[PDB]
Design an enzyme around this catalytic site. Structure first.
Site, short mmCIF file in Angstrom:
data_model
loop_
_atom_site.label_atom_id
_atom_site.label_comp_id
_atom_site.label_asym_id
_atom_site.label_seq_id
_atom_site.Cartn_x
_atom_site.Cartn_y
_atom_site.Cartn_z
N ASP A 108 0.80 -1.22 0.00
CA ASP A 108 0.00 0.00 0.00
C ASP A 108 0.84 1.27 0.00
O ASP A 108 0.30 2.37 -0.02
CB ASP A 108 -1.05 0.00 1.13
CG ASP A 108 -0.45 0.24 2.51
OD1 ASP A 108 -1.23 0.31 3.49
OD2 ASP A 108 0.78 0.38 2.73
N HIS B 173 -2.17 9.38 6.33
CA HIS B 173 -1.78 8.21 7.13
C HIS B 173 -0.33 8.16 7.57
O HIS B 173 0.00 7.44 8.51
CB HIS B 173 -2.08 6.89 6.39
CG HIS B 173 -3.53 6.68 6.09
ND1 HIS B 173 -4.50 6.68 7.07
CD2 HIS B 173 -4.16 6.45 4.92
CE1 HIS B 173 -5.68 6.47 6.51
NE2 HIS B 173 -5.50 6.33 5.21
N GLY C 72 -0.56 3.41 3.75
CA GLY C 72 -1.74 3.66 2.92
C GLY C 72 -1.61 4.74 1.85
O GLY C 72 -2.41 5.67 1.81
N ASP D 243 -12.24 12.13 4.28
CA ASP D 243 -11.83 10.91 3.59
C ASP D 243 -12.57 9.73 4.21
O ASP D 243 -12.90 9.75 5.41
CB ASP D 243 -10.32 10.74 3.79
CG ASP D 243 -9.74 9.66 2.91
OD1 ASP D 243 -9.10 9.98 1.89
OD2 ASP D 243 -9.90 8.46 3.18
N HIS E 209 -11.36 7.09 5.11
CA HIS E 209 -10.51 6.48 6.13
C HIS E 209 -10.20 7.45 7.27
O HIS E 209 -10.23 8.67 7.09
CB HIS E 209 -9.22 5.94 5.49
CG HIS E 209 -9.47 4.88 4.45
ND1 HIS E 209 -9.59 5.19 3.11
CD2 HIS E 209 -9.67 3.55 4.56
CE1 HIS E 209 -9.81 4.08 2.43
NE2 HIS E 209 -9.88 3.07 3.28
N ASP F 105 -12.97 9.04 -1.75
CA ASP F 105 -13.21 7.60 -1.69
C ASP F 105 -14.49 7.24 -0.93
O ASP F 105 -14.80 6.07 -0.76
CB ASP F 105 -11.98 6.81 -1.19
CG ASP F 105 -11.39 7.36 0.11
OD1 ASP F 105 -11.90 8.37 0.70
OD2 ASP F 105 -10.36 6.84 0.60
N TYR G 277 -10.48 6.57 -5.86
CA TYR G 277 -9.89 5.53 -6.68
C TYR G 277 -10.70 5.16 -7.90
O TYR G 277 -10.23 4.39 -8.74
CB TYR G 277 -9.59 4.32 -5.79
CG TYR G 277 -8.80 4.76 -4.59
CD1 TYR G 277 -9.36 4.71 -3.30
CD2 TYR G 277 -7.53 5.29 -4.74
CE1 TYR G 277 -8.63 5.15 -2.19
CE2 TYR G 277 -6.80 5.73 -3.66
CZ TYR G 277 -7.35 5.66 -2.38
OH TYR G 277 -6.60 6.11 -1.32
C1 TSN Z 1 -4.47 1.70 1.68
C2 TSN Z 1 -5.89 1.91 1.24
C3 TSN Z 1 -6.49 3.26 1.15
C4 TSN Z 1 -6.14 4.26 1.95
C5 TSN Z 1 -6.81 5.59 1.83
O1 TSN Z 1 -7.64 5.81 0.95
N1 TSN Z 1 -6.52 6.54 2.72
O2 TSN Z 1 -7.39 7.40 2.99
C6 TSN Z 1 -6.68 0.87 0.93
C7 TSN Z 1 -6.25 -0.58 0.98
C8 TSN Z 1 -7.00 -1.21 2.13
C9 TSN Z 1 -6.63 -1.22 -0.33
O3 TSN Z 1 -7.77 -1.61 -0.54
C10 TSN Z 1 -5.61 -1.29 -1.41
C11 TSN Z 1 -6.05 -1.58 -2.70
C12 TSN Z 1 -5.12 -1.64 -3.73
C13 TSN Z 1 -3.78 -1.40 -3.50
N2 TSN Z 1 -2.87 -1.47 -4.58
C14 TSN Z 1 -3.34 -1.76 -5.93
C15 TSN Z 1 -1.45 -1.22 -4.41
C16 TSN Z 1 -3.35 -1.10 -2.20
C17 TSN Z 1 -4.26 -1.05 -1.15
C1 TSN Z 2 -6.98 1.66 -3.97
C2 TSN Z 2 -6.93 1.14 -5.38
C3 TSN Z 2 -7.90 0.14 -5.87
C4 TSN Z 2 -8.49 -0.75 -5.07
C5 TSN Z 2 -9.45 -1.75 -5.59
O1 TSN Z 2 -10.11 -2.38 -4.78
N1 TSN Z 2 -9.57 -1.95 -6.91
O2 TSN Z 2 -10.28 -2.88 -7.39
C6 TSN Z 2 -5.99 1.55 -6.25
C7 TSN Z 2 -4.92 2.56 -5.92
C8 TSN Z 2 -3.56 1.98 -6.28
C9 TSN Z 2 -5.14 3.85 -6.67
O3 TSN Z 2 -5.90 3.90 -7.63
C10 TSN Z 2 -4.37 5.08 -6.27
C11 TSN Z 2 -4.50 6.24 -7.03
C12 TSN Z 2 -3.79 7.38 -6.70
C13 TSN Z 2 -2.95 7.38 -5.60
N2 TSN Z 2 -2.22 8.53 -5.27
C14 TSN Z 2 -2.39 9.77 -6.04
C15 TSN Z 2 -1.26 8.48 -4.17
C16 TSN Z 2 -2.81 6.22 -4.82
C17 TSN Z 2 -3.52 5.07 -5.16
NA NA Z 3 -11.90 10.66 7.33
ZN ZN Z 4 -9.13 7.02 2.08
#
Ligand code: TSN
Ligand code: TSN
Ligand code: NA
Ligand code: ZN
Ligand code: CA
Ligand code: CA
Ligand code: NA
Length: 364
Positions: A88, A130, A138, A165, A167, A254, A293
């Site tokens: 993450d 986070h 995260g 958010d 979270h 989100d 996301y």
């Molecule tokens: C860490 C997070 C969001 C935090 C947030 O939004 N902070 O506010 C969600 C986790 C539970 C998750 O579901 C996840 C999904 C895909 C992923 N990769 C595709 C790398 C990595 C983590």
């Molecule tokens: C959480 C998720 C999907 C979860 C799922 O459950 N998919 O099915 C995907 C992550 C990788 C994502 O999209 C993201 C985008 C921007 C970002 N930053 C701008 C820091 C960090 C993370």
């Molecule tokens: Na929040």
């Molecule tokens: Zn979040």
């Protein structure tokens, strides 16, 4: 008077530069630009945060690690698991420059507020709530929200941090859990196994900071009207008890219906009512993004919220631009509610709100 919009093509490129992390910054900016909202704002290029500025919150050892990994690594470093890097928060090249950019942007936004350039300053690419002093978490390598607060603290005695958010804003809460100078208020999903697991209503801060942390645990499927009623209830009580001198508002998208987080059932209109309520205080306000996301939905959301900051009602038609096809098949600004139950029982919500009210009676 006009809001500051933290933007440069370089900054957007940097925010979009990490391998495998999806390219959201350009989508968000391009949609705002498509609606021509940047023309109504003071466009400010962000500075890049110096080592010293990031070290305002983050430890030397963590920052030095982030730098080493950002240069050469992905794996091959013994300390990276402990430093919070992994799935993450991937160890990939450029993470340090990325972090520096976002930290710098939020600090630039804060500086604009301090200088009285504006009353609202926007960094849609920030809000990475986070990260801890010594640990990534995260998607947050660097806690730009904390950096913004600390920058504002140069001028404004008491800061209110509001975290909408999905979270829990645990990194920000933790940073300021031991002080009355910063109050953190987070509305979030709170459920067994749900990230990051913290932020129960009974978490109220510690020491001199006892009762200056507020946590609002919410269940799956909440919609606009109910969310706003909760948000307004708590914020009204918070504002009266704490009397903030500046606000940092994290607006992770989100919570929005259609997000892969599949938790809340909000639309930008609901978040927008919360934003409006806060803006009406007419305090220096630093606006951050965060999670979000469904990329098109997140751009839809923050564009809409940019509109409310500007007091403008935007066309429902998504204008032609670089990422227009991403808005298909309907190509509209508005988000529909999924058909999903609201798991929030009125009686539990009232109990939570009563508890926070009890806590806020100790402030301050
Ligand atoms: C860490 C997070 C969001 C935090 C947030 O939004 N902070 O506010 C969600 C986790 C539970 C998750 O579901 C996840 C999904 C895909 C992923 N990769 C595709 C790398 C990595 C983590
Ligand atoms: C959480 C998720 C999907 C979860 C799922 O459950 N998919 O099915 C995907 C992550 C990788 C994502 O999209 C993201 C985008 C921007 C970002 N930053 C701008 C820091 C960090 C993370
Ligand atoms: Na929040
Ligand atoms: Zn979040
Ligand atoms: Ca330090
Ligand atoms: Ca002082
Ligand atoms: Na605090």
């Amino acid at each position: 008077l006009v809001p500051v919009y933290i933007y440069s093509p370089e900054y957007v490129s940097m925010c979009d530069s990490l391998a495998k992390i999806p390219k959201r910054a350009s989508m968000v900016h391009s949609l705002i630009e498509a609606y021509a909202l940047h023309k109504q704002m003071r466009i400010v290029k962000p500075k890049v945060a110096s080592m010293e500025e990031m070290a305002t919150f983050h430890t030397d050892a963590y920052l030095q690690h982030l730098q080493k990994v950002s240069q050469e690594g992905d794996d091959d470093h013994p300390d990276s698991i402990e430093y919070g890097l992994g799935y993450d928060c991937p160890a990939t090249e450029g993470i340090f420059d990325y972090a520096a950019a976002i930290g710098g942007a939020t600090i630039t936004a804060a500086q604009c507020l301090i200088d009285g350039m504006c009353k609202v300053a926007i960094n849609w690419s920030g809000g990475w709530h986070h990260a801890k002093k010594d640990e990534a978490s995260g998607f947050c390598y660097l806690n730009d929200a904390v950096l913004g607060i600390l920058r504002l603290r140069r001028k404004f005695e008491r800061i209110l941090y509001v975290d909408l958010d999905l979270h829990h804003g645990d990194g920000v809460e933790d940073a300021f859990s031991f002080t009355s100078k910063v109050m953190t208020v987070s509305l979030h999903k709170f459920s067994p196994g749900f990230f990051p697991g913290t932020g129960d209503v009974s978490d109220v801060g510690l020491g001199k900071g006892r009762y200056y942390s507020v946590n609002v645990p919410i269940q799956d499927g909440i919609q606009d009207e109910k969310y706003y009623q909760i948000c307004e209830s708590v914020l009204k009580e918070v504002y009266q008890a704490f009397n903030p001198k500046a606000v940092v508002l994290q607006l992770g998208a989100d919570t929005i219906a259609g997000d892969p987080m599949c938790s809340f059932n909000m639309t930008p209109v609901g978040i927008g009512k919360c934003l409006k309520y806060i803006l009406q205080w007419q305090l220096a306000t630093l606006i951050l993004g965060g999670g979000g996301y469904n990329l098109a939905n997140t751009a839809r959301c923050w564009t809409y919220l940019t509109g409310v900051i500007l007091g403008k009602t935007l066309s429902s038609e998504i204008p032609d631009h670089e990422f227009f096809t991403a808005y298909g098949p309907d190509y509209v600004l508005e988000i529909t509610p999924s058909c999903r139950p609201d798991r929030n029982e009125p009686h539990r919500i009232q109990q939570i709100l009563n508890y926070i009210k009890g806590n806020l009676k100790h402030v301050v």
